[PDB]
Amino acid sequence: PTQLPYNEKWEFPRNNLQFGKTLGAGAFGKVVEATAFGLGKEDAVLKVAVKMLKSTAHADEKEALMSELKIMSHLGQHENIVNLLGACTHGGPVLVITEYCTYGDLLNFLRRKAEAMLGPSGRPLELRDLLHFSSQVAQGMAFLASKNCIHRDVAARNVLLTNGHVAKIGDFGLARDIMNDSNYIVKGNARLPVKWMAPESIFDSVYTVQSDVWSYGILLWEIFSLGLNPYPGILVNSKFYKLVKDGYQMAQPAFAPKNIYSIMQACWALEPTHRPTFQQITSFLQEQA
Ligand SMILES: COc1cnc2[nH]cc(Cc3ccc(NCc4ccc(C(F)(F)F)cc4)nc3)c2c1
Secondary structure (H helix, E strand, O other): OOOOOOOHHHHHHHHHHHEEEEEEOOOOEEEEEEEEEEEEOOOOEEEEEEEEEEEOOOOOHHHHHHHHHHHHHOOOOOOOOOEEEEOOOOOOOOOEEEEEOOOHHHHHHHHHHHHHHHOOOOOOOOOHHHHHHHHHHHHHHHHHOOOOOOOOOOHHEEEEEEEOOOOOOHHHHHHHHOOOOOOOEOOOOOOHHHHHOOHHHOOOOOOOOOOOHHHHHHHHHOOOOOOOOOOOOOOHHHHHOOOHHOOOOOOOOOOOHHHHHHHHHHHOOOOOOOOOHEEEHHHHHHHOO
C-alpha cells in the first residue's frame, strides 16, 4: 500500500520538460500541460499532463503523490485509463508525467457539446457517441478490477477524452479544488462525492469493486443526461441518506434507451454482489455501440 517500490524505469529529466498552461488546480496540487523531449523508447516529443504539488503542500501531500505514482507503475497500461508516462523523483519536487487528453474531462465536454447543439435556435453528438464513451470507461474500469484496484471516485469529471474522442478514466485528486466543489459533501472529517457513493460506502465506509460499479451507474446517468447533476435539486441530508438506503433511484435520463437505464438500475442494486461485473457491462455496451 505504501511499501511498493518505485522503479526508476519511469525516471525522466525535469529539464526535459517545458511547461505550458495549468489545466487544473486544487488546494495543494495542480495539473500543468508540458512538452517532454525524448520521452519513452522512441524518444518521442509530445504534449504531456504533469501532476505536481504546490508550494503550500506538505510532507503529507508528498507521500500521497508518491503512493499514487507507485500504484500507476504497479497497475500496468490500458487504452482506457490515463497512463503513466514517466516521473521525476530526483533533484526536486515529485512530478508525475501522464498522457495528455486534448478534450479534458468528459463532464464539461458533454456540457459544452450540448450547448453547441442547442446553439442554432466539431460535429454534434449522436447516441452512438455516448454508447462508445460509456463502453470505454467500462473497459477501463474492468482493467482496474482485474488488478484488485479500487478507484473510489468514479465520475465524469475524472474521465478524460483524448484525440479520436477516446475516454480514459483518471483521478484529478490533489489537482481538484474539492474544498469549494459542491459535488463533494462534508461528511465528518472527510469531503466525499456522496451522490456517486454506494450505500455501504456511505454508512459502513466500505469500498469494493462493487461500490465502484455503483458509482459507474451514476456515471452512466451523467452521460445520458449530457452532464446534469445527480439527484438534481436534492440537498444531501438525513432524508437523502435514508432514501438511498431504502432503494431510491434516479429517474430515466432524457437520452438513455430503456435497456441502458436498465443497466443503471442494476448498478444500483442495494446488494453489492447482485450488481454486474465491469466485464459484464463492457461486453453488453460493446455490443450496443
Ligand atoms: C484537463 O485537461 C487535461 C488533458 N490531459 C490530461 N491528462 C490527464 C489529465 C488530468 C489528470 C492527470 C493525471 C491523472 N493521474 C491520476 C490518476 C490516478 C489513477 C488513475 C487510474 F487509476 F485510473 F489508473 C489514473 C490517473 N489523472 C488525471 C488531463 C487533463
